[PDB]
């Protein structure tokens, strides 16, 4: 979670963010973080604050939300690779300590607010108490196995796996709300890949190659720039935000030139500030091999998925039947070929 990166690319390079809709991708393999979608559909999809409690005692909210997201994402021709989250390294343990004390504050404030009877703040601070579990990802990967969409499990982090999937050319893009994929290495990053999307919050297709050309720096210096923005692995220098890190990176390329020309009485270097290992973790992370894995969009079993969602996930028969029929007519037709495959760009045009 790089603080102030998307705003930096928005106010520096609006040409690099090729803003478009969900109609603009035909047959593009898109490797998506699963855990971002699972938290989005455990937080946004609510029964008034009851997160879709079924008749057996489980949570069917996230399966509902990302099932219909995946059906409308095959309706637009986008081929998803739901890359699941991995076991986080030792550098993200401080960020999960921050998340654990944030959950502790939210739990204490939820127990304060449930006595007060302010039921909207009760809903807010049970929406801030959403935790991913092993059974949530296990039943979600079971749903991916049932509906024929391929999935991957990351060894370390899903953003690194998505970025090396773009880097190997296996997929076209990553679809994360997280901005770490521009530093784990993905040249093309879409954001806000939702199903119900016409004009309300459309796709921010970030381009790492475009911003490295227009600010004039390679991957390692952009990794260092997002260290000084402040990532979720190691801390940043206090007093340096977007514009100061952009100016100091563009005037001083290496991280040693950032460090040694700084007085400690105005810009302190923090204690145990591990920039080298976070640099090596953005350049070479623990990633599963993208050439070794295979991405196959198989035909789903229809009535078995219907009896699964209507026997122990408590859905409607006609709703799941309509969804599997929608994906079946999505996979029936031929793919729509693009025009940049056949014609090559000579040069852009100004105004």
């Amino acid at each position: 979670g790089i603080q102030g990166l998307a705003k930096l690319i928005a106010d520096v390079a609006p040409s690099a963010i090729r803003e478009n809709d969900i109609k603009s991708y035909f047959g593009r393999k898109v490797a998506i973080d699963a855990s971002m979608s699972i938290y989005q559909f455990l937080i946004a999809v609510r029964q008034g604050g009851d997160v879709l409690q079924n008749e057996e005692g489980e949570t069917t909210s996230h399966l509902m939300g990302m099932f219909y997201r995946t059906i409308r994402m095959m309706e637009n021709g986008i081929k998803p690779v739901y890359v699941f989250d991995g076991k986080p390294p030792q550098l993200k343990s401080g960020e999960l300590a921050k998340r654990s004390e944030r959950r502790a504050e939210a739990e204490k404030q939820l127990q304060q607010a449930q006595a007060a009877g302010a039921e909207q703040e009760v809903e807010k601070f049970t929406k801030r108490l959403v935790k991913v579990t092993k059974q949530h990802n296990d039943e979600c990967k079971h749903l991916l196995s049932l509906m024929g969409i391929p999935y991957l499990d990351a060894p370390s982090e899903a953003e690194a796996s998505c970025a090396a999937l773009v880097k190997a050319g296996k997929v076209y893009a990553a679809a994360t709300e997280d901005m770490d994929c521009l530093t784990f290495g993905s040249p093309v990053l879409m954001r806000h890949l939702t199903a119900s999307e016409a004009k309300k919050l459309p796709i921010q297709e970030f381009h790492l190659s475009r911003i490295l050309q227009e600010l004039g720096l390679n991957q390692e210096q952009f990794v260092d720039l997002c260290i000084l923005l402040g990532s979720d692995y190691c801390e940043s220098i206090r007093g340096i935000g977007p514009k100061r890190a952009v100016d100091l990176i563009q005037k001083h390329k290496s991280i040693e030139e950032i460090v040694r020309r700084l007085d400690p009485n105005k810009y302190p270097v923090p204690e145990n500030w591990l920039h080298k290992e976070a640099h090596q973790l953005f350049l070479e992370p623990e990633v599963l091999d993208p050439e070794s894995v295979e991405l196959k969009w198989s035909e789903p079993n229809e009535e078995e998925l219907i009896k699964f969602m209507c026997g122990e996930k408590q859905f409607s028969e006609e709703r799941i039947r309509s969804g599997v029929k929608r994906l079946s007519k999505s996979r029936q037709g031929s793919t729509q070929g693009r025009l940049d495959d056949f014609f090559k760009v000579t040069g852009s045009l100004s105004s």
């Binding site: 035909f26 940049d340 040069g347 045009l349 100004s350 105004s351």
Partner: protein
Amino acid sequence: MFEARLVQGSILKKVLEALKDLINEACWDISSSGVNLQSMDSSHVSLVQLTLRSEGFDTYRCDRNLAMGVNLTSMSKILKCAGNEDIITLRAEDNADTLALVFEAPNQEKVSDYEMKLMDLDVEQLGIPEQEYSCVVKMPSGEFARICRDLSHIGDAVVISCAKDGVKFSASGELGNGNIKLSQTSNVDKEEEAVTIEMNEPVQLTFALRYLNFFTKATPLSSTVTLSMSADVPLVVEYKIADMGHLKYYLAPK
């Protein structure tokens, strides 16, 4: 520095009525040799290659190369403020942030100046190789618009096959199937109706139909669609604009 007096500006109105349903923002590649627009769809499927040469404009005096980023639905709403007889005069000022469009009526009683706003766009210009096509089909434009409008009711994709007898516009969908055959004719008295097919090999391709229905808004320009095909090269849907040039619509197959 750019002035383009067009007496027959009805076909300019037809160009911008054809353009607004497909692309919303484009840049005119205005040069001294003519006016061009090579802009691509937002879904990155279809290209519009436009050419209005300087011979068709009756007073063209543009000095240097000018690229003008324009909202084409706004430009078409400006050009809907002229009738079918007015002399649409393109005019651009120094450091042109406005496009002055003078709609002089030919009876010299109504002069409609429309200086309309622009935008900053960075659009790419693709490289089109000038290479010969396998199946060059020259049908009427109204019949092609009719064919695309009928086949859009069945399914979203024609499967167009050229053959020895003629071009076949096969399409299928949830309403069933539809095949439209067009024999090559030469015995008609009108040269617009004569479906001329330049055969090299019989080739079968599949094209989307929303883009083809977007292409067939250019049918009031002239009654000549030059469908040009190859094995995997995109379809050229070429409209002869009357004595300026072409409205070559490109379409990547399926």
